[PDB]
Design a protein around this ligand. Structure first.
Ligand SMILES: COC(=O)C1CCN(C(=O)NC(C)(C)C)CC1
Ligand SMILES: COC(=O)C1CCN(C(=O)NC(C)(C)C)CC1
Ligand SMILES: [Cl-]
Ligand SMILES: [Mg+2]
Ligand SMILES: [Mg+2]
Ligand SMILES: [Mg+2]
Ligand SMILES: [Mg+2]
Lengths: 194, 194
């Protein structure tokens, strides 16, 4: 019943653009919205985010997260490992690659979501969420070697799955970091289950 | 180590703006980033709230109450937690309860409120509080809930059982062109993983 009538470019950067979207509301009235899109999409989705379940015998299962300075935020953020999908890369391949580059761990694919939206009242940005298990008892994941690109700089933070929400809340209170909404949502559900 | 040096306005709409961000990398090199921000953020501790609404009823499995609406940035319909921006001077909790009632008809009770969490921190500064609310669906106020949508707003409510959320979401995605929100999908994945 609702649909897009036209999209007008307002401003195009190298990585992001702003558009004015005209759409039909279901009463038959024409309305406008300001919409953000990336200029890099090719792809099932813009990017991947990896839920990396670090499994080590006789240890708690950990979720592997990353801490980076995020210029839009003006500060450091704790997030799932993530990045944009390379033109002609599968989501699964992007997930293992990003996980390796950002954390050093080599993982196995458990499941892959359909493309899911990041902030749909603002942007068209989408990701696949890829659940990956990491056998922490293999020699390849003993001394995990991250492969950081020229200028990126990413710290790895592993937190136990069974207390995730409490551990994140602590990092926010003590370190003045911003936790990612996806990460927080995941943590909340771990507590809310059963 | 890293920090913002300057933020220059590239383009400003009514609702969203694009900025060129200059920041200091940890090697001491000056770098730039294209950053999205809303124009609506004043003294709120975040831009908005998203509500995790747990519908509780005697002799029923718990449901998660979601909303479906057309999202012009996405060019289609999305399934999301109930959500809206925080009014000036409004608390996150009040915003959460108000948006839940407006979008769903339900009158909830606060359970928890997250710190401000980031929506897409490689792209935007946008942040939300995630507010967990229980809904007593045995209360007469919550028997025949009618959405009180604003002008030009059209929201559909979809209540799914918490114990089967991810499969029910997958079944909805299999049957129509619709996109699930990444926070909803993250929450459903954790409910499975727990
Ligand atoms: C990025 O944000 C925008 O472009 C505005 C567009 C106007 N607006 C609405 O709520 N539109 C209704 C009231 C007709 C539903 C708020 C968001
Ligand atoms: C909205 O996106 C942007 O503005 C670009 C800015 C450049 N860029 C980088 O990856 N920069 C590193 C390698 C220094 C980390 C991608 C993101
Ligand atoms: Cl798992
Ligand atoms: Mg990344
Ligand atoms: Mg990368
Ligand atoms: Mg809303
Ligand atoms: Mg609303």
């Amino acid at each position: 019943k609702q649909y897009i009538i036209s999209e007008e470019l307002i401003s195009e950067g190298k990585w992001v653009k702003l558009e004015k979207t005209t759409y039909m509301d279901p009463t038959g009235k024409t309305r406008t919205w300001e919409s953000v899109k990336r200029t890099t999409r090719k792809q099932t989705a813009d990017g991947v985010a990896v839920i990396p379940v670090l499994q080590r015998t006789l240890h708690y299962e950990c979720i592997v997260l990353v801490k980076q300075f995020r210029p839009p935020m003006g500060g450091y953020c704790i997030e799932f490992p993530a990045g944009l999908i390379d033109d002609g890369e599968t989501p699964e391949a992007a997930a293992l690659r990003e996980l390796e580059e950002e954390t050093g761990y080599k993982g196995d694919i458990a499941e892959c979501s359909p493309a899911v939206c990041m902030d749909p009242g603002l942007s068209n940005c989408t990701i696949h969420i890829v659940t990956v298990t990491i056998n922490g008892d293999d020699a390849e994941n003993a001394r995990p070697k991250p492969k950081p690109g020229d200028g990126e700089f990413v710290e790895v933070i592993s937190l136990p799955k069974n207390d995730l929400l409490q551990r994140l809340d602590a990092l926010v209170a003590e370190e003045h970091l911003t936790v990612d909404a996806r990460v927080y949502s995941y943590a909340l559900a771990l507590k809310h289950a059963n």
